[PDB]
A paper describes a structure:
Herein, we have described and characterized the structure and catalytic mechanism of BiuH, a cysteine hydrolase that hydrolytically deaminates biuret during cyanuric acid catabolism by R. leguminosarum bv. viciae 3841. BiuH is structurally and mechanistically different from the ‘canonical’ AtzE from Pseudomonas sp. strain ADP, which fulfils the same physiological role; i.e., it liberates a nitrogen atom from the triazine ring and allows further degradation to make all three nitrogen atoms bioavailable. The protein is a tetramer (consistent with SEC); each monomer adopts a five-stranded parallel β-sheet which is surrounded by α-helices. Helices α2, α4 and α5 (residues 95–102, 178–186, and 202–213, respectively) make symmetric interactions to another protomer in the tetramer, forming a dimer, as part of the basis of the quaternary structure.
The native protein was purified (20 mg from 1 litre of culture, concentrated to 10 mg/mL) and crystallized after removal of the His-tag in situ using chymotrypsin, in neutral conditions containing medium or high molecular weight polyethylene glycols as precipitants. Proteolysis did not impact the activity of the purified enzyme. Depending on the structure and the chain, the loop containing residues 44–53 is at least somewhat disordered and has a higher B-factor than most of the rest of the protein. The average B factor for the chains where the loop is mobile (in more than one conformation) is about double that of the average B factor for both the whole of the protein chain and double what is seen for the same loop (44–53) in other chains where there is a single conformation. Phe41 is found in a mobile loop that appears to occlude the active site when not occupied by the substrate.
Numbering used by the authors:
A (entry chain D), C (entry chain B): 8 to 233
B (entry chain A), D (entry chain C): 4 to 233
Write the structure that this text describes.
Amino acid sequence: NRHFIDADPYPWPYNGALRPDNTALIIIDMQTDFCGKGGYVDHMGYDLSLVQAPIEPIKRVLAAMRAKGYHIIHTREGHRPDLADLPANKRWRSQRIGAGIGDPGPCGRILTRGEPGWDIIPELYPIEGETIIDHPGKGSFCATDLELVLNQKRIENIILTGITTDVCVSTTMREANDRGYECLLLEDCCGATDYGNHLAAIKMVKMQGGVFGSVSNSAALVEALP
Amino acid sequence: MVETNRHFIDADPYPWPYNGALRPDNTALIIIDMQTDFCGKGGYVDHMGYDLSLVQAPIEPIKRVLAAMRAKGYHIIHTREGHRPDLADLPANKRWRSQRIGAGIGDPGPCGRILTRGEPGWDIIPELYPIEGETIIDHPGKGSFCATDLELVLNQKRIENIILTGITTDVCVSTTMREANDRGYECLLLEDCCGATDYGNHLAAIKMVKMQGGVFGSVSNSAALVEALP
Amino acid sequence: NRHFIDADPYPWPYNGALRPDNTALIIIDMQTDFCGKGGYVDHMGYDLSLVQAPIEPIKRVLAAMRAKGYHIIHTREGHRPDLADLPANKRWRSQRIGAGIGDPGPCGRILTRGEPGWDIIPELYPIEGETIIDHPGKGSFCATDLELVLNQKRIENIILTGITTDVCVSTTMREANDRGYECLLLEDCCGATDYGNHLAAIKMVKMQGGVFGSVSNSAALVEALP
Amino acid sequence: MVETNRHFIDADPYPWPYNGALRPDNTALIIIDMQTDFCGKGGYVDHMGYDLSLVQAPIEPIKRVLAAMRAKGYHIIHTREGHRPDLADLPANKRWRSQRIGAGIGDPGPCGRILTRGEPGWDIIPELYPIEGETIIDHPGKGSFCATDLELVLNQKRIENIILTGITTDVCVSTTMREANDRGYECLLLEDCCGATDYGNHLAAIKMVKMQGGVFGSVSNSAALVEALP
């Protein structure tokens, strides 16, 4: 009763134990300031097109997985408004490049919880029953309840999407993988503002027999999802 | 004439550490996973075929950094990827992938059971071997913090700054750096003191550090470190 | 320049390094449902006076520590409204005794974030700059950002107050202690609805040369606080 | 006869485990810190002046539970409180308190360095010694989860239910139970298979488990467990 998604370097999940009850989609950090028109990333002159590219593929995956009753998780990078959870180095670096965390930006205080720019874009907005992880690190597990939630939901398999490929997506995948979760990265459902780093982050997954999991795409997923 | 207790290493994208608080008592070198099976002649990677040279390249630069930091009384930490001999800490997926490529964790290899604690091939190579007082982290994950006492040890030693070296750049080195960075540690990657199975992935992992004002920390090299280390 | 508070079994903190910048008060779980008139604990017929007894001493400590610019932290036990962070056993036990987590109670859904009964009582309410930890376990560190926050604030010493002595107070103290924090329990600033368990939890702290830290009282603290 | 795959142990305040899902593959015994120095002459606990009879009392009941659970193929886990020999994992306060009462961690004792890994007094007593395949957790905290791989191991073994035994009831046993419970594990404390430095603290720690509908789990005894274990 095994089901697999075509993937590289191996058909996923490794053991074919692919069910709604043990599998989650995670949509990482699809926040206005990071990928929306007029957000701080746009205003900083970064290559915003590369982080908008995954929106439509993600929307298709999200619709398909909702329809089939899979677990859906979303994440938002951000800090408490009093900045208690903000490391001094993280803050200093952000100030040095003119995107200081907690400072005013075009859509509110940058990377600050409760602000408009920090929220998820409307095109990928959560619905009730889809857990949202608010995380202060680049890996979504650090200092959050993500692992607790995954464990109570008895999730074994994680399908990763979102931004950026080389930062929060890769870090969260690595954290999950170390703990035993079986992870699939959808290459057309992630992006970074450096395309080379996007492609390299994906390549890294596949090495050594799928060191961090396996890689597929939205069409292959939607076609074969049970 | 004018003396300062702030000290920096020339680094990219910013001089490191960010605040110049660079002292023996708050700074550690970490040498990641310089183990025989991974970089050594006759280990399991060698027995599979062609190319150890990329993961051996950092040995001499690491040795220079290690010697310099020992002489100046900096904290020195080493790590080893590996599993309990009964494999209780080995996830099923990790095991299955390693079996599928012919390097099954816990399976017999030319230097003992692959990635298995206590076996000859699993140990750190003699030329970078720890000495007394240099903590060794035995880790079952690619990130050295997961399921270990690394963070507890760092905190009791009041370590603020970490200098990362070892192998592989894109796997255990990058994962450990990301975990440390998230927790507030200030990290420097020495680019000539790491290497990977694919040189392009090595270079990309280094580039990733530098983006967005040094998202994971900063990058330097052994010569710049040794020259400016207080 | 060492400063100590009189305490049992040793003067606290162990090394006398007692400063506003390295020391936090933590006020644990002083929530309406747990200690307020008409909350679920009151309606169940427990002896509410034992968990109200610490309010006035806590107020005195809180005022003194605010005035001197010490770090102030508050905690609230609770669950996400969709109960994603609620273990099945925790839920089942609560249902079995007629205080089901997430079920309707006299002040709103029991132990559910955002509900009236779940919030901190008005007499001990946080002010801006005082971090609040929302925790799904009895130990406030589990699945939260408390440790991350303590580390960024460079906190070494923790003064524990709140309720209940034997559950969240003792558990949070034990977690902190294991990680190297130096902890003081203020015995008149905690309570439980079984006074024997309160007293025993306090006794446990002092054994073996102060296995979990040291114990004092609000008067001794306020008198000697630098 | 009507047969069921739900099975319960008579326990207080509720029959355990809550859902009756009690099988060898999902259930572990954990034997906490039955080490020579906690329950034998010359140890840490001995140096503090406590009465050894209270911590020896659980030996025979634990032995019976251990034998029964081994025979039925249940998971068996053991723990040892202790520190790396260089004391890198030893908080300064923990060390200072132990020195103040004359049982300094790492100081020489009649059975080796107190609470120091690799020393004779730190090892598990022979009457409860692990066998191959029984994971041992070496922990620097009073809660066995802190800074260890216990959680990772539990998760890879798909353990849901934990039966706790060992010493001391109010310190490492209670702390480990609370950590497990918070993470969703379903825990049973065997009251005749634990003991403490003060019998009243033992009894109170057990009572604490039962309050509020079994806030930390449920409580039973060796005879009830062995009688009903599937």
